[PDB]
Ligand binder design. Structure first.
Ligand SMILES: *[C@@H]1O[C@H](CO)[C@@H](O)[C@H](O)[C@H]1NC(C)=O
Ligand SMILES: *[C@@H]1O[C@H](CO)[C@@H](O)[C@H](O)[C@H]1NC(C)=O
Lengths: 110, 495, 75, 75, 49, 49, 50, 75
């Protein structure tokens, strides 16, 4: 039940598809479907982009898709518009009843 | 669709000519109802709340003795007197001690002795009672639509919560898009709250029988005593000791909290903080589906492609739930969903999420279906791009029948004579069965009240033996049947 | 004491876990087992009395089990 | 619980009076009587069962007594 | 969930039924039980003879 | 005199530091670090998932 | 079942009935072995020392 | 030991060769033969016992075979 691992930075030209990886353990990410992706713009509170591995909130674009394989969960952005440039944090409800947040990644887009 | 993922889910199939069905709700259990042209619904009793409880008796579980006084009388002078002896907040006892010249009497014999100590309660357990008119059951009706959670909506799920009280026992849930459902509930029979006490001890509460509570061996106040200076039965929590007939001392008998916890075994624990919430009740209702309608029946079949966004999983009840998403042109459309054989020439399984529809394109819908025992194929979509999924169900039809008979017998054991109303649509056979069960349950409750499960098993074995060794065939079979029934009830009791 | 009237058999039983159900299901039977282990002398005499009282074989075993159950629980 | 296994039959009894001898001498019998009063139904059934299982009046009475005493204690 | 199951002082008092109480506030004094002695009268003289 | 203590019994306890761990079905049992310590009372059960 | 550098395909109930010290799949500290007594022997040969 | 309970009759067996199938197909028979040779005395007693508890040639032979097979097997 330790911090999930994500690449420090991710970049992708506009219109390309960009993928972020969240690697946990058999209890953090490989044990449960409590994988949620949070988008946080600088100076603002995080925004829940995905939950339940794949599901997204009502107001969240359809360009955000989540996948989970084994102990690794991935977030993929397709349109990759300029408004998609932010820090993306992965989280998971661990088997011990606690919450672990990934280190976070940054999309540069341009 | 909350009723999936719960092991006590139970399926009610069909309605009567009047479009109503009788269903018994329970707190741990959940009910899924399916009618021909009505959508599938999930009913669960979530909250039972008793309001305005009145205390009928306070029991002392940890007493205290403070001011001990004693008075002695010389032999042949009768019993002595203490003015504390007629004080009600003092516990007193009369005994005899050896008296003589050394003691200061002048006669040789037994001299009367009295000792008194002030009885003070340090901890008590409040037994409260609730009027049956003050029960307020809370039920949740969620249409088993297949729609996923919505963040923007004021209600994230489309489950609707309806409160049923004994006075307002008829209520209708308005399920947006599905018409309305009406519940004609009977709270007054769910629990007999005139024979129940809400027994709250220090930080924990139980729902207990009222005669049991009134027959406890502890000091008790009538419940209206704010001063608490007239405890009854004070001698059950003190001991008077006279060893060697020389002195007499009285001591308190120790905190009775653990003894009360042991005496509470077999009592259902109920929350009694921030309201009197009971999570053990059952409620009988008559469900009226006449104003309940399927959503999107006047839609066209989807022509696009479906992708599974949540791999097909098998629930504990022998059905399968899958989550599909739509990539087609028709914004709202009926999802083509069938459970067929490999060659697709026979329909083997039936849908539980009846009329699966795709309201929004980028919004997956998750479908519960009941595949047949063995191999079957879940076909989703139409030929161009159609996705076909295989599945194997590991049971057997005879096994499912045996499991269903076991479940029916178990609900009869729990909701004795009320199980007949769990799926009844009226009918002569149901009424005859319910009446016979009422008579036999009355007899059984008379002849087996206040008996443990081991005693029930012993009596069942004895009755079965008597039936087995019986000259008459009618009495032999009747006694063997009674023995088998009481053996089963003893095995299934005390849970 | 109050613990000797346990509220076990008073009806009122739902499909919800009651207080100390799993623990208290066999605790009395386990008590009887420990008592019979500690007091084998009484069990032999109870068996002899059951055998000498009652003619049928069923009768003797019924008496023996009843006596061995009452003995420890007579308190 | 501990209260279910009292120290009554230990054989360590002197002329000095014990802890709750006066109180507990009749507690068990009083509790059996109260139980029979509250739960009359089982008493009649036990009487019928004892009558059926006992060939002689001694067997019937002894069996009925044992059944009546066991039912409350067994709880 | 797990609960602590209250205090067992009173249940223990009920369990101790049939045990002779003794003293332990100072020295573990016992005021029960017998003692078997043999009397030696040989060297006993009447005081007022 | 000088009696040696033979056995200490607990008559009133208190539970604290309660913790829970869960596993998904068919994945064996969960693990709590507190299970190693013997002063933690622990129990294994199954809940619907 | 994978042992040192070799793997097998075994029956689940057979594997869960193996008489060896075990950890649960998510034990994650690695030190709380369950039936350790299967892998140790306690000897008190003359009732003199253990 | 783990070796005492092998993964033999579990119904998982394919056409692909199983672990230690070839060599281990006859280990039990070889061990039984070696044990019987090392301990001829017990086999005579087993034969005598099987003949004593007989009443049919088939019965005696089966009893002797089972005794000789389980005598080395029961540790
Ligand atoms: C009981 O004793 C206490 C000791 O402080 C005393 O204050 C109180 O007045 C006494 N009550 C009586 C003797 O009724
Ligand atoms: C238990 O909780 C207390 C806080 O009430 C804390 O001080 C203590 O360190 C905790 N101990 C353990 C073993 O968790």
């Amino acid at each position: 039940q330790s911090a999930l691992t994500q690449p420090a930075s991710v970049s992708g030209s506009p219109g390309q598809s960009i993928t972020i990886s969240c690697t946990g353990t058999s209890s953090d990410v490989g044990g449960f479907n409590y994988v949620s992706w949070f988008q946080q713009h600088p100076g603002k509170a995080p925004k829940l982009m995905l939950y339940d591995v794949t599901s997204r909130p009502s107001g969240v674009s359809s360009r955000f898709s989540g996948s989970k394989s084994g102990n690794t969960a991935s977030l993929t952005i397709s349109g990759l518009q300029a408004e998609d440039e932010a820090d993306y944090y992965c989280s998971s409800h661990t088997s011990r009843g606690t919450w672990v947040f990934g280190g976070g990644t940054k999309l540069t887009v341009l | 669709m909350r009723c999936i993922g719960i092991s006590n889910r139970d399926f009610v199939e069909g309605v009567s000519g009047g479009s109503w069905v009788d269903i018994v709700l329970e707190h741990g259990s959940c009910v899924t109802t399916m009618a021909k042209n009505k959508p599938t619904l999930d009913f669960e009793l979530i909250k039972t709340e008793a309001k305005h409880p009145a205390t009928l008796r306070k029991y002392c579980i940890e007493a205290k003795l403070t001011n001990t006084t004693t008075a002695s009388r010389c032999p042949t002078q009768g019993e002595p007197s203490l003015n504390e002896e007629q004080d009600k907040r003092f516990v007193c006892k009369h005994s005899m001690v050896d008296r003589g010249w050394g003691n200061g009497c002048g006669l040789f014999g037994k001299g009367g002795i009295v000792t008194c100590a002030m009885f003070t309660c340090k901890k008590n357990m409040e037994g409260k009672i609730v009027q049956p008119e003050n029960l307020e059951y809370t039920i949740v009706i969620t249409p088993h639509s297949g729609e996923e959670n919505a963040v923007g909506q004021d209600t994230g799920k489309h489950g609707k919560e309806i409160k049923v009280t004994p006075q307002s026992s008829i209520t209708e849930a308005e399920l947006t898009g599905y018409g309305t459902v009406t519940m004609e509930c009977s709270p007054r029979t769910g629990l007999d709250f005139n024979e129940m006490v809400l027994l709250q001890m220090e930080n924990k509460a139980w729902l207990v029988h009222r005669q049991w509570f009134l027959d406890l061996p502890l000091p008790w106040l009538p419940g209206a005593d704010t001063q608490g200076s007239n405890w009854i039965q004070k001698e059950t929590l003190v001991t008077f000791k006279n060893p060697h007939a020389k002195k007499q001392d009285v001591v308190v008998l120790g905190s009775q909290e653990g003894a009360m916890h042991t005496a509470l075994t077999g009592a259902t624990e109920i929350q009694m903080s921030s309201g009197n919430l009971l999570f053990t009740g059952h409620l009988k209702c008559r469900l009226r589906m006449d104003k309940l309608q399927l959503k999107g029946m006047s839609y066209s079949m989807c022509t696009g492609k479906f992708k599974v966004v949540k791999e097909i999983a098998e629930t504990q009840h022998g059905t399968i739930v899958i989550r599909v998403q739509y990539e087609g042109d028709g914004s709202p459309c009926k999802i083509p969903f069938e459970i067929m054989d490999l060659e697709k020439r026979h329909v083997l399984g039936r849908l539980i999420t009846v009329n699966p529809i795709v309201t929004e394109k980028d919004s997956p819908v998750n479908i519960e279906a009941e595949p047949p025992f063995g191999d079957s194929y879940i076909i989703i979509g139409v030929e161009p791009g159609q996705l076909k999924l295989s599945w194997f169900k590991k049971g057997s039809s005879i096994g499912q029948m045996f499991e269903t008979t076991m479940r029916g017998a178990k609900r009869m054991a729990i909701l004795g004579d009320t199980a007949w109303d769990f799926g009844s649509l009226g009918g002569v056979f149901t009424s005859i069965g319910k009446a016979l069960h009422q008579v036999f349950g009355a007899i059984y409750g008379a002849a087996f009240s206040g008996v443990s499960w081991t005693m029930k098993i012993l009596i069942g074995v004895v009755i079965t033996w008597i039936g087995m060794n019986s000259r008459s065939t009618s009495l032999s079979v009747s006694l063997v049947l009674v023995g088998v029934v009481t053996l089963y009830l003893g095995v299934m009791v005390q849970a | 004491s109050v613990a000797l009237v346990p509220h076990v058999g008073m009806g009122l039983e739902t499909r919800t876990e009651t207080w100390m159900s799993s623990e208290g299901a066999w605790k009395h039977a386990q008590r009887i087992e420990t008592w019979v282990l500690r007091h084998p002398g009484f069990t032999i005499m109870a068996a002899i009395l059951a055998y000498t009282i009652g003619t049928t074989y069923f009768q003797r075993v019924l008496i023996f089990i009843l006596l061995t159950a009452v003995a420890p629980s007579m308190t």
